[model samples]
Target: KCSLTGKWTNDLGSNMTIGAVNSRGEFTGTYITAVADNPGNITLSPLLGIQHKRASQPTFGFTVNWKFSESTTVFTGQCFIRNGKEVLKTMWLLRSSVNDIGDDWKATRVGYNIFTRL
Candidate 1:
């Protein structure tokens, strides 16, 4: 099952603490807190839902598509753009539950699938 169980942060300086996640790419959370006037809980309705219990913005009103792999997932979404240069925004969200080791890179690139105009 794909469940979102952890701490999450947003642009509002507030955060949504995840309660659970399922294989269907949906998540639920608890309302921890919000900043000042933007204090509230988060909820999503119908058409597959992912509830962020303390989000004070659009995170409650959008559909997030998640793709599951061996031990990872990619979350992609499209929503209203806040800037003039961008019409649709897409994000590469990764999820995994494996104990793997790796080395850190010193701010360098040596690959062939990093940037491309899709």
Candidate 2:
């Protein structure tokens, strides 16, 4: 699988991390970013070109199509940043339980934080 870069934000702020493929097909990466109050203009390369697919830069919306090999695992997802936050507009699940994020925040936001096996 290909490496990944994630971006996310919450009431605290926004940030991102690098991710890797695990045996389960899920990906895990580190969290790294600064708090952003307003759109600060932080540019990030989409983890996979699939982020764009046949579409242009996705803002209020985007999709990431992928699959996993494990029943459940965690991965990283991020979004293009402006200031220090992510809008998290859209996502695509190409695979099912192969990958499942426990946190509702995972699918709720257009962006995400790096998750590790606790």
Candidate 3:
């Protein structure tokens, strides 16, 4: 059993998956989405290369690089254990970009994850 291996659902009616961690303490998955229009009216395409870090430590951090079609975004963030590792409290940002509109507003976008083990 990997550290962060499970299916995670988000508030935006989407899912984030983390696969089994490898020997290098690395796992990758995807952010599944459909379509939505409420706050900011988001219409996301499929995002891939969702990676996180879970080292041999009590508190762990994560980093992710994903391509959402027109732009490639990276998230460098942190997380901690909850209920004896039954849940992961995640918070990240669109900190940097590649082939993207590198503006102040774009960098300000924040994302959070509350993943209940399922």
Candidate 4:
């Protein structure tokens, strides 16, 4: 199993520290986003992950329930070797709105945050 039991960094200054991984491929870790989107400085958020691969294929995902304000993002990604290095590239969908004046505001936004071992 490709264990994610190390420190990771994203495109920006955001960093993640994963916990011990069991055979089930589930893990919980701390994720600190460097982006200045939060109210003040960076926010220490809890990140949950699950990598299931019973067959020859693998399907795993991660989610972060941001603290404060209306925010939560879910991501689906695959882990593979690239440029002689392991990488985790995830496409995320952030909940933009749940209830607002228009239905469009209720829609979610999307982004790609690539991760690599530090």
Candidate 5:
């Protein structure tokens, strides 16, 4: 099972508030960042998808994607559920194109976020 619901925070002074995650794996959220020169706010629309797979002997992993209406950037990332849905450790790529840029810091704007559910 996968979810994109609730609130999360990261080391980079960024926060996310996910409003909904429907049965179709579609979601909605807002992302706020204070790490930039100006405080950045992203009003996300139709944040989508959640796919799960095995990671190791006892761990399962998941991936999700989000879209930013403010900057027209898309984020796709991998995460693992922690403490029974309390937290998610994720790394993602922020891109503006159709091709998959992935989570490479040098290739695209990369985001490593540790999200805590509220």
Candidate 6:
């Protein structure tokens, strides 16, 4: 039942703090990455998203705008019960800035991440 109001952590020790969900299923928080391609770029970034609160297993998506880097990451995922624990299984696409001569394909990264309630 859209049980997404809490803090979560991934395998990389990245933190996902979901503040609160309103009646409209909108929430806000901060996302901090434990790993990055850029050296010493670890920092908390603002996150915004929405979820399907009516669903048994809700689907959600959120975006993180990197203030330290020229990139933005959007994560789309679903809430599930894994071994009696709540987990967020997600896929993400990160779009980094590109030069005019740069290949657009190289500017985008695709990956998967799973977050469990902490």
Judging by TM-score against the true structure, name the best candidate. 6
Cα lDDT computed for each candidate against the true fold:
0.32, 0.32, 0.49, 0.75, 0.48, 0.86
Which number leads on lDDT?
A: 6
Number of clashing residue pairs, candidate 3: 0
In order of lDDT, best first, we have 6, 4, 3, 5, 2, 1
- Give every collision pair in model 5: none
lDDT for each residue of candidate 5 in 12-43, tens digit (9 for 90 to 100): 66676676655444555666654432235343
lDDT of 1 by residue, 5-84 (tens): 55544443434445455544366544222332222432321123453434322232222222222222232433232343
In order, what is each prediction's RMSD in angstroms? 17.0, 13.2, 5.2, 2.6, 6.5, 1.5
Question: Which ranges in model 4 have alpha carbons more than 4 Å from their true place?
Answer: 39-41, 53-58, 101-106
Candidate 6 lDDT, 35-56, residue by residue in tens: 7879497777999999998898
Worst 10 residues of 4 by lDDT: 51-60
Clashes of each: 5, 11, 0, 0, 0, 0
Per-residue CA lDDT of model 4 for 4-117, tens digit only, reads 777988897788888886678888988888774554755688989888656323556888877754677887877776466778778888876557567875577888888888
What is the model-wide C-alpha lDDT for candidate 4? Answer: 0.75
Report model 4's TM-score to 2 decimal places.
0.80
Model 1 clashing-pair count:
5
Estimate the TM-score of every prediction. Answer: 0.29, 0.22, 0.53, 0.80, 0.52, 0.91
**Cα RMSD, model 3:** 5.2
lDDT of 3 by residue, 1-118 (tens): 2256667665546666677666665566666544222334344333333333444422444544433333333334334453555555566555543455655455445666565555
TM-score of candidate 5 versus the correct structure, residues matched by position: 0.52
